[PDB]
Amino acid sequence: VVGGTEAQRNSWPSQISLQYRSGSSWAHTCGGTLIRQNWVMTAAHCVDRELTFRVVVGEHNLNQNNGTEQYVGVQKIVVHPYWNTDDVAAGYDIALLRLAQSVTLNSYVQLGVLPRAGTILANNSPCYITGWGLTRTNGQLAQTLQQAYLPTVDYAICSSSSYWGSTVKNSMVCAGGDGVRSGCQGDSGGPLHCLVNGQYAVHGVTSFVSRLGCNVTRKPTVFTRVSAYISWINNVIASN
Ligand code: NA
C-alpha cells in the first residue's frame, strides 16, 4: 500500500497473509480475506505459481511475534475456471483456498462479510485497502499492516479513455487513482473494505495496478468485484 497509514491491530481481523516457502523460511506474497473458518478468498494470479503456500491469520507485523498469529497450511486451491493468467484484464481474478485446519476466531481473527450479490457502489464511496504490499513503486514490503483510503471510481469513469478504457470490466471495482495512495505489489488478493449502511464489507479482491507504477493519477487500483461472484463462492464451498 502506497500512501497508507499503519492499521490498528484489531481493525481488519479478516485480513490474512498468504506466504510461500522460501528455503528455510516463509515469505509474504499476497493478501486474502478469511471467509469461513477454513476458507480464504484471494486473487487467482496469486496462486499461479506452483509453490507451497500457508496462510497466516491474526498477523500484524510480518517480521515480529505479535502473540496473535495462527499459521495454517493450504489444503486445496480452487481458481475460477474462466481465469486466464495470459489476460488479467479479462477478469475472473479470484480463487478460494481451503485451509488444512479451521482457525479459531477472536478480536484479531474474524470472517469477512461479503456484500449481497449484484451490489454496486456509488461513485466516490468510502473504502479502505489493506495489506503488506510495497510502500512505494519498486519499493519494499511493509512490515506492519497498512491501510489507505481509496474512494471508488464508478465503471463509467473508470472505463473512460483517460482512465482504464476497455481494460476495466463491469465485474471489477476501481478505487483511488489520486496519484498518492494505491495498492501495490504484495497487496494483491487482499480486501477492499467499504462502509455501507454502517458496516464494512469486503467489496473487492485486489487484482492489478498500472505497469507504469502503483500510484498513478487516473489509474485507480482495480479489484475483482466480490458481489459478482457470490454464487460462485457459495457453490465452491458447498461442493468442497
Ligand atoms: Na507477526
PDB file of C-alpha atoms and ligand atoms in Angstrom:
ATOM      1  CA  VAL A   1       0.000   0.000   0.000  1.00  0.00           C
ATOM      2  CA  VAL A   2       1.446   3.307  -1.140  1.00  0.00           C
ATOM      3  CA  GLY A   3       0.489   6.332   0.937  1.00  0.00           C
ATOM      4  CA  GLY A   4      -1.055   4.282   3.667  1.00  0.00           C
ATOM      5  CA  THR A   5      -1.036   4.549   7.439  1.00  0.00           C
ATOM      6  CA  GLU A   6      -0.431   1.757   9.938  1.00  0.00           C
ATOM      7  CA  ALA A   7      -3.634  -0.091  10.776  1.00  0.00           C
ATOM      8  CA  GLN A   8      -4.678  -0.610  14.380  1.00  0.00           C
ATOM      9  CA  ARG A   9      -4.096  -4.305  15.111  1.00  0.00           C
ATOM     10  CA  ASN A  10      -7.807  -5.153  15.617  1.00  0.00           C
ATOM     11  CA  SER A  11      -9.266  -3.051  12.774  1.00  0.00           C
ATOM     12  CA  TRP A  12      -9.277  -5.614   9.894  1.00  0.00           C
ATOM     13  CA  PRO A  13      -9.494  -9.098  11.502  1.00  0.00           C
ATOM     14  CA  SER A  14     -10.424 -10.817   8.244  1.00  0.00           C
ATOM     15  CA  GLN A  15      -7.155  -9.836   6.545  1.00  0.00           C
ATOM     16  CA  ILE A  16      -4.709 -12.735   6.013  1.00  0.00           C
ATOM     17  CA  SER A  17      -1.132 -13.002   4.753  1.00  0.00           C
ATOM     18  CA  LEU A  18      -0.570 -15.611   2.044  1.00  0.00           C
ATOM     19  CA  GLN A  19       3.008 -16.860   2.236  1.00  0.00           C
ATOM     20  CA  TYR A  20       5.165 -19.286   0.333  1.00  0.00           C
ATOM     21  CA  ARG A  21       8.015 -21.468   1.452  1.00  0.00           C
ATOM     22  CA  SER A  22      11.319 -19.900   0.526  1.00  0.00           C
ATOM     23  CA  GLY A  23      14.312 -22.007   1.539  1.00  0.00           C
ATOM     24  CA  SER A  24      14.229 -22.374   5.308  1.00  0.00           C
ATOM     25  CA  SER A  25      11.758 -19.527   5.674  1.00  0.00           C
ATOM     26  CA  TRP A  26       8.350 -18.243   4.630  1.00  0.00           C
ATOM     27  CA  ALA A  27       7.823 -15.129   2.511  1.00  0.00           C
ATOM     28  CA  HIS A  28       4.708 -12.963   2.204  1.00  0.00           C
ATOM     29  CA  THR A  29       3.410 -12.851  -1.319  1.00  0.00           C
ATOM     30  CA  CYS A  30      -0.250 -11.748  -1.268  1.00  0.00           C
ATOM     31  CA  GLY A  31      -3.190 -10.850   0.876  1.00  0.00           C
ATOM     32  CA  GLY A  32      -6.555 -12.527   1.241  1.00  0.00           C
ATOM     33  CA  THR A  33      -9.780 -12.481   3.249  1.00  0.00           C
ATOM     34  CA  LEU A  34     -10.912 -15.172   5.690  1.00  0.00           C
ATOM     35  CA  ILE A  35     -14.480 -16.012   4.613  1.00  0.00           C
ATOM     36  CA  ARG A  36     -15.075 -19.230   6.619  1.00  0.00           C
ATOM     37  CA  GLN A  37     -13.007 -20.699   9.432  1.00  0.00           C
ATOM     38  CA  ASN A  38     -11.420 -22.980   6.803  1.00  0.00           C
ATOM     39  CA  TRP A  39     -11.685 -20.893   3.593  1.00  0.00           C
ATOM     40  CA  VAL A  40      -9.796 -17.886   2.294  1.00  0.00           C
ATOM     41  CA  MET A  41     -10.624 -15.715  -0.713  1.00  0.00           C
ATOM     42  CA  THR A  42      -7.712 -14.357  -2.731  1.00  0.00           C
ATOM     43  CA  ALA A  43      -6.778 -13.454  -6.345  1.00  0.00           C
ATOM     44  CA  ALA A  44      -6.194 -16.244  -8.831  1.00  0.00           C
ATOM     45  CA  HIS A  45      -2.996 -14.684 -10.046  1.00  0.00           C
ATOM     46  CA  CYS A  46      -1.536 -15.043  -6.534  1.00  0.00           C
ATOM     47  CA  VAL A  47      -1.697 -18.812  -6.777  1.00  0.00           C
ATOM     48  CA  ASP A  48      -0.463 -19.177 -10.395  1.00  0.00           C
ATOM     49  CA  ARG A  49       2.953 -20.366  -9.243  1.00  0.00           C
ATOM     50  CA  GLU A  50       3.496 -23.988  -8.177  1.00  0.00           C
ATOM     51  CA  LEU A  51       4.608 -23.038  -4.639  1.00  0.00           C
ATOM     52  CA  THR A  52       3.965 -24.350  -1.154  1.00  0.00           C
ATOM     53  CA  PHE A  53       1.541 -21.895   0.496  1.00  0.00           C
ATOM     54  CA  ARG A  54       0.427 -21.148   4.025  1.00  0.00           C
ATOM     55  CA  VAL A  55      -1.988 -18.651   5.448  1.00  0.00           C
ATOM     56  CA  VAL A  56      -1.381 -16.517   8.494  1.00  0.00           C
ATOM     57  CA  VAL A  57      -4.373 -15.092  10.346  1.00  0.00           C
ATOM     58  CA  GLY A  58      -4.033 -12.640  13.208  1.00  0.00           C
ATOM     59  CA  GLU A  59      -0.916 -11.181  11.645  1.00  0.00           C
ATOM     60  CA  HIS A  60       0.105  -7.553  12.145  1.00  0.00           C
ATOM     61  CA  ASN A  61       3.872  -7.338  11.806  1.00  0.00           C
ATOM     62  CA  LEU A  62       5.381  -9.761   9.293  1.00  0.00           C
ATOM     63  CA  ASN A  63       8.794  -9.533  10.950  1.00  0.00           C
ATOM     64  CA  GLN A  64       7.901  -9.732  14.697  1.00  0.00           C
ATOM     65  CA  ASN A  65       5.945 -12.002  17.015  1.00  0.00           C
ATOM     66  CA  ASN A  66       2.543 -10.359  17.594  1.00  0.00           C
ATOM     67  CA  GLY A  67       1.319 -13.009  20.014  1.00  0.00           C
ATOM     68  CA  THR A  68      -1.864 -13.388  17.955  1.00  0.00           C
ATOM     69  CA  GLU A  69      -0.911 -15.357  14.816  1.00  0.00           C
ATOM     70  CA  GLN A  70      -2.297 -18.702  13.681  1.00  0.00           C
ATOM     71  CA  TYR A  71      -0.387 -20.445  10.852  1.00  0.00           C
ATOM     72  CA  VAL A  72      -2.249 -22.883   8.640  1.00  0.00           C
ATOM     73  CA  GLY A  73      -1.396 -24.823   5.518  1.00  0.00           C
ATOM     74  CA  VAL A  74      -3.371 -24.579   2.303  1.00  0.00           C
ATOM     75  CA  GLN A  75      -5.050 -27.928   1.504  1.00  0.00           C
ATOM     76  CA  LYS A  76      -6.892 -27.183  -1.742  1.00  0.00           C
ATOM     77  CA  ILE A  77      -6.817 -24.316  -4.236  1.00  0.00           C
ATOM     78  CA  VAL A  78      -9.885 -23.644  -6.358  1.00  0.00           C
ATOM     79  CA  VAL A  79      -9.260 -20.972  -9.020  1.00  0.00           C
ATOM     80  CA  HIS A  80     -12.166 -19.574 -11.010  1.00  0.00           C
ATOM     81  CA  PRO A  81     -12.480 -21.840 -14.073  1.00  0.00           C
ATOM     82  CA  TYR A  82     -12.536 -18.883 -16.506  1.00  0.00           C
ATOM     83  CA  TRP A  83      -9.291 -17.376 -15.122  1.00  0.00           C
ATOM     84  CA  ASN A  84      -6.554 -16.924 -17.724  1.00  0.00           C
ATOM     85  CA  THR A  85      -3.204 -15.916 -16.302  1.00  0.00           C
ATOM     86  CA  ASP A  86      -2.438 -14.550 -20.062  1.00  0.00           C
ATOM     87  CA  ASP A  87      -5.217 -11.989 -19.529  1.00  0.00           C
ATOM     88  CA  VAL A  88      -5.804 -10.377 -16.076  1.00  0.00           C
ATOM     89  CA  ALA A  89      -7.979  -7.730 -17.827  1.00  0.00           C
ATOM     90  CA  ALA A  90     -10.495 -10.382 -18.783  1.00  0.00           C
ATOM     91  CA  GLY A  91     -11.394 -10.736 -15.145  1.00  0.00           C
ATOM     92  CA  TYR A  92     -12.186 -13.801 -13.065  1.00  0.00           C
ATOM     93  CA  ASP A  93      -9.173 -12.974 -10.834  1.00  0.00           C
ATOM     94  CA  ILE A  94     -10.441 -14.884  -7.801  1.00  0.00           C
ATOM     95  CA  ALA A  95      -9.539 -18.121  -6.027  1.00  0.00           C
ATOM     96  CA  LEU A  96     -10.641 -19.928  -2.895  1.00  0.00           C
ATOM     97  CA  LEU A  97      -8.201 -21.713  -0.599  1.00  0.00           C
ATOM     98  CA  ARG A  98      -9.407 -24.460   1.725  1.00  0.00           C
ATOM     99  CA  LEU A  99      -7.276 -24.467   4.873  1.00  0.00           C
ATOM    100  CA  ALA A 100      -5.881 -27.660   6.447  1.00  0.00           C
ATOM    101  CA  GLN A 101      -7.361 -26.676   9.823  1.00  0.00           C
ATOM    102  CA  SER A 102     -10.163 -24.393  10.926  1.00  0.00           C
ATOM    103  CA  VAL A 103      -8.867 -21.277  12.585  1.00  0.00           C
ATOM    104  CA  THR A 104     -10.108 -20.004  15.939  1.00  0.00           C
ATOM    105  CA  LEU A 105     -11.995 -16.673  15.893  1.00  0.00           C
ATOM    106  CA  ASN A 106     -11.167 -13.804  18.277  1.00  0.00           C
ATOM    107  CA  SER A 107     -10.746  -9.979  18.095  1.00  0.00           C
ATOM    108  CA  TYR A 108      -7.824 -10.491  15.670  1.00  0.00           C
ATOM    109  CA  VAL A 109      -9.388 -13.277  13.529  1.00  0.00           C
ATOM    110  CA  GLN A 110     -12.905 -12.854  12.094  1.00  0.00           C
ATOM    111  CA  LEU A 111     -14.782 -13.749   8.932  1.00  0.00           C
ATOM    112  CA  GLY A 112     -15.034 -11.059   6.285  1.00  0.00           C
ATOM    113  CA  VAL A 113     -18.534 -10.121   5.449  1.00  0.00           C
ATOM    114  CA  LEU A 114     -19.358 -10.124   1.773  1.00  0.00           C
ATOM    115  CA  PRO A 115     -21.856  -7.860   0.005  1.00  0.00           C
ATOM    116  CA  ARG A 116     -25.138  -9.017  -1.315  1.00  0.00           C
ATOM    117  CA  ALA A 117     -24.996 -10.345  -4.889  1.00  0.00           C
ATOM    118  CA  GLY A 118     -25.149  -7.658  -7.552  1.00  0.00           C
ATOM    119  CA  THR A 119     -24.384  -4.713  -5.257  1.00  0.00           C
ATOM    120  CA  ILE A 120     -22.592  -1.858  -6.989  1.00  0.00           C
ATOM    121  CA  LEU A 121     -21.078   1.028  -5.056  1.00  0.00           C
ATOM    122  CA  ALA A 122     -21.996   4.612  -5.951  1.00  0.00           C
ATOM    123  CA  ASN A 123     -19.145   6.709  -7.312  1.00  0.00           C
ATOM    124  CA  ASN A 124     -16.810   8.045  -4.642  1.00  0.00           C
ATOM    125  CA  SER A 125     -17.910   5.568  -1.973  1.00  0.00           C
ATOM    126  CA  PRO A 126     -15.659   5.355   1.095  1.00  0.00           C
ATOM    127  CA  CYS A 127     -13.340   2.360   1.125  1.00  0.00           C
ATOM    128  CA  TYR A 128     -10.011   1.246   2.578  1.00  0.00           C
ATOM    129  CA  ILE A 129      -7.448  -1.040   1.004  1.00  0.00           C
ATOM    130  CA  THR A 130      -5.336  -3.012   3.443  1.00  0.00           C
ATOM    131  CA  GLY A 131      -2.150  -5.016   3.032  1.00  0.00           C
ATOM    132  CA  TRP A 132       1.546  -5.513   3.489  1.00  0.00           C
ATOM    133  CA  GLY A 133       2.467  -4.699  -0.123  1.00  0.00           C
ATOM    134  CA  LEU A 134       5.142  -2.339  -1.383  1.00  0.00           C
ATOM    135  CA  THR A 135       5.061   1.096   0.184  1.00  0.00           C
ATOM    136  CA  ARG A 136       6.425   2.756  -2.963  1.00  0.00           C
ATOM    137  CA  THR A 137       6.565   1.744  -6.593  1.00  0.00           C
ATOM    138  CA  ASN A 138       9.592  -0.556  -6.892  1.00  0.00           C
ATOM    139  CA  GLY A 139       9.964  -0.343  -3.119  1.00  0.00           C
ATOM    140  CA  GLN A 140       9.736  -2.925  -0.361  1.00  0.00           C
ATOM    141  CA  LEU A 141       7.022  -4.641   1.619  1.00  0.00           C
ATOM    142  CA  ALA A 142       5.615  -3.004   4.671  1.00  0.00           C
ATOM    143  CA  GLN A 143       6.439  -4.646   7.967  1.00  0.00           C
ATOM    144  CA  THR A 144       3.160  -3.680   9.629  1.00  0.00           C
ATOM    145  CA  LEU A 145      -0.289  -3.887   8.067  1.00  0.00           C
ATOM    146  CA  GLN A 146      -1.140  -0.694   6.174  1.00  0.00           C
ATOM    147  CA  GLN A 147      -4.442   0.894   5.212  1.00  0.00           C
ATOM    148  CA  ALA A 148      -5.221   3.610   2.670  1.00  0.00           C
ATOM    149  CA  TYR A 149      -8.435   5.438   1.995  1.00  0.00           C
ATOM    150  CA  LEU A 150      -9.404   4.843  -1.661  1.00  0.00           C
ATOM    151  CA  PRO A 151     -12.788   6.184  -2.780  1.00  0.00           C
ATOM    152  CA  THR A 152     -14.453   4.153  -5.537  1.00  0.00           C
ATOM    153  CA  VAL A 153     -14.427   5.279  -9.135  1.00  0.00           C
ATOM    154  CA  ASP A 154     -17.541   4.031 -10.937  1.00  0.00           C
ATOM    155  CA  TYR A 155     -17.461   1.992 -14.131  1.00  0.00           C
ATOM    156  CA  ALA A 156     -18.469   4.833 -16.413  1.00  0.00           C
ATOM    157  CA  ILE A 157     -15.468   6.885 -15.283  1.00  0.00           C
ATOM    158  CA  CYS A 158     -13.003   4.044 -14.813  1.00  0.00           C
ATOM    159  CA  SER A 159     -13.654   2.633 -18.267  1.00  0.00           C
ATOM    160  CA  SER A 160     -13.280   6.018 -19.952  1.00  0.00           C
ATOM    161  CA  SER A 161     -10.295   6.693 -22.183  1.00  0.00           C
ATOM    162  CA  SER A 162      -8.092   8.658 -19.761  1.00  0.00           C
ATOM    163  CA  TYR A 163      -8.620   6.066 -17.039  1.00  0.00           C
ATOM    164  CA  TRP A 164      -8.514   2.358 -17.878  1.00  0.00           C
ATOM    165  CA  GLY A 165     -10.586   2.247 -21.082  1.00  0.00           C
ATOM    166  CA  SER A 166     -11.586  -1.250 -22.167  1.00  0.00           C
ATOM    167  CA  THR A 167      -9.258  -2.937 -19.658  1.00  0.00           C
ATOM    168  CA  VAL A 168     -11.734  -2.464 -16.825  1.00  0.00           C
ATOM    169  CA  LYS A 169     -14.832  -4.654 -16.893  1.00  0.00           C
ATOM    170  CA  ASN A 170     -18.120  -4.419 -15.035  1.00  0.00           C
ATOM    171  CA  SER A 171     -17.007  -7.435 -12.962  1.00  0.00           C
ATOM    172  CA  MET A 172     -14.369  -5.158 -11.342  1.00  0.00           C
ATOM    173  CA  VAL A 173     -14.295  -2.303  -8.873  1.00  0.00           C
ATOM    174  CA  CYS A 174     -11.894   0.599  -9.219  1.00  0.00           C
ATOM    175  CA  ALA A 175     -10.779   2.731  -6.278  1.00  0.00           C
ATOM    176  CA  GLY A 176      -8.312   5.531  -5.794  1.00  0.00           C
ATOM    177  CA  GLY A 177      -6.331   6.959  -8.698  1.00  0.00           C
ATOM    178  CA  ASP A 178      -5.352  10.208  -6.869  1.00  0.00           C
ATOM    179  CA  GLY A 179      -1.642   9.734  -7.570  1.00  0.00           C
ATOM    180  CA  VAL A 180      -0.715   9.462  -3.898  1.00  0.00           C
ATOM    181  CA  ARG A 181      -2.492   6.366  -2.492  1.00  0.00           C
ATOM    182  CA  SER A 182      -2.906   2.960  -4.050  1.00  0.00           C
ATOM    183  CA  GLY A 183      -2.439  -0.744  -3.863  1.00  0.00           C
ATOM    184  CA  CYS A 184       0.942  -2.100  -4.894  1.00  0.00           C
ATOM    185  CA  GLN A 185       2.664  -5.440  -5.390  1.00  0.00           C
ATOM    186  CA  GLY A 186       2.146  -7.732  -2.411  1.00  0.00           C
ATOM    187  CA  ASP A 187      -1.351  -6.320  -1.802  1.00  0.00           C
ATOM    188  CA  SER A 188      -2.946  -8.484  -4.499  1.00  0.00           C
ATOM    189  CA  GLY A 189      -5.603 -10.786  -3.285  1.00  0.00           C
ATOM    190  CA  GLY A 190      -6.373  -8.684  -0.242  1.00  0.00           C
ATOM    191  CA  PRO A 191      -9.584  -6.875   0.565  1.00  0.00           C
ATOM    192  CA  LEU A 192     -11.136  -3.546  -0.358  1.00  0.00           C
ATOM    193  CA  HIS A 193     -13.329  -2.755   2.669  1.00  0.00           C
ATOM    194  CA  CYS A 194     -16.242  -0.435   2.003  1.00  0.00           C
ATOM    195  CA  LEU A 195     -18.556   1.123   4.507  1.00  0.00           C
ATOM    196  CA  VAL A 196     -22.194   0.507   3.570  1.00  0.00           C
ATOM    197  CA  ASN A 197     -25.211   1.020   5.905  1.00  0.00           C
ATOM    198  CA  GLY A 198     -22.876   1.344   8.815  1.00  0.00           C
ATOM    199  CA  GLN A 199     -20.987  -1.913   8.271  1.00  0.00           C
ATOM    200  CA  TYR A 200     -17.688  -2.629   6.466  1.00  0.00           C
ATOM    201  CA  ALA A 201     -17.944  -5.364   3.865  1.00  0.00           C
ATOM    202  CA  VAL A 202     -15.302  -6.739   1.517  1.00  0.00           C
ATOM    203  CA  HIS A 203     -16.338  -5.487  -1.933  1.00  0.00           C
ATOM    204  CA  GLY A 204     -13.072  -6.096  -3.736  1.00  0.00           C
ATOM    205  CA  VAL A 205     -10.189  -8.520  -4.127  1.00  0.00           C
ATOM    206  CA  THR A 206      -7.085  -6.570  -5.197  1.00  0.00           C
ATOM    207  CA  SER A 207      -6.235  -7.556  -8.807  1.00  0.00           C
ATOM    208  CA  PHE A 208      -3.983  -5.077 -10.656  1.00  0.00           C
ATOM    209  CA  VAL A 209      -2.379  -1.676 -10.965  1.00  0.00           C
ATOM    210  CA  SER A 210      -0.726   0.086 -13.891  1.00  0.00           C
ATOM    211  CA  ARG A 211       2.523  -1.176 -15.427  1.00  0.00           C
ATOM    212  CA  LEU A 212       3.614   2.475 -15.162  1.00  0.00           C
ATOM    213  CA  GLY A 213       3.526   2.330 -11.387  1.00  0.00           C
ATOM    214  CA  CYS A 214       1.351   1.781  -8.366  1.00  0.00           C
ATOM    215  CA  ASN A 215       0.151   5.277  -7.556  1.00  0.00           C
ATOM    216  CA  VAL A 216      -0.541   6.795 -10.963  1.00  0.00           C
ATOM    217  CA  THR A 217      -3.166   9.515 -11.407  1.00  0.00           C
ATOM    218  CA  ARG A 218      -6.216   8.175 -13.300  1.00  0.00           C
ATOM    219  CA  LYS A 219      -5.081   4.595 -12.950  1.00  0.00           C
ATOM    220  CA  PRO A 220      -7.043   3.583  -9.837  1.00  0.00           C
ATOM    221  CA  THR A 221      -6.310   0.242  -8.263  1.00  0.00           C
ATOM    222  CA  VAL A 222      -8.504  -2.453  -9.829  1.00  0.00           C
ATOM    223  CA  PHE A 223     -10.237  -5.128  -7.795  1.00  0.00           C
ATOM    224  CA  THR A 224     -12.319  -8.166  -8.627  1.00  0.00           C
ATOM    225  CA  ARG A 225     -15.915  -7.238  -7.679  1.00  0.00           C
ATOM    226  CA  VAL A 226     -16.865  -9.707  -4.968  1.00  0.00           C
ATOM    227  CA  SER A 227     -20.589  -9.128  -5.460  1.00  0.00           C
ATOM    228  CA  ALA A 228     -20.336 -10.600  -8.980  1.00  0.00           C
ATOM    229  CA  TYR A 229     -19.036 -13.936  -7.583  1.00  0.00           C
ATOM    230  CA  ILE A 230     -21.341 -14.660  -4.627  1.00  0.00           C
ATOM    231  CA  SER A 231     -22.945 -17.668  -6.341  1.00  0.00           C
ATOM    232  CA  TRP A 232     -19.556 -18.982  -7.464  1.00  0.00           C
ATOM    233  CA  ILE A 233     -18.130 -18.690  -3.942  1.00  0.00           C
ATOM    234  CA  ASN A 234     -21.141 -20.433  -2.373  1.00  0.00           C
ATOM    235  CA  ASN A 235     -21.045 -23.186  -4.996  1.00  0.00           C
ATOM    236  CA  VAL A 236     -17.370 -23.908  -4.397  1.00  0.00           C
ATOM    237  CA  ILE A 237     -17.744 -24.039  -0.623  1.00  0.00           C
ATOM    238  CA  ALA A 238     -20.844 -26.253  -0.829  1.00  0.00           C
ATOM    239  CA  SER A 239     -19.074 -28.754  -3.137  1.00  0.00           C
ATOM    240  CA  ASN A 240     -15.851 -28.959  -1.089  1.00  0.00           C
TER     241      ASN A 240
HETATM  242 NA    NA B   1       3.869 -11.227  13.360  1.00  0.00          NA
END
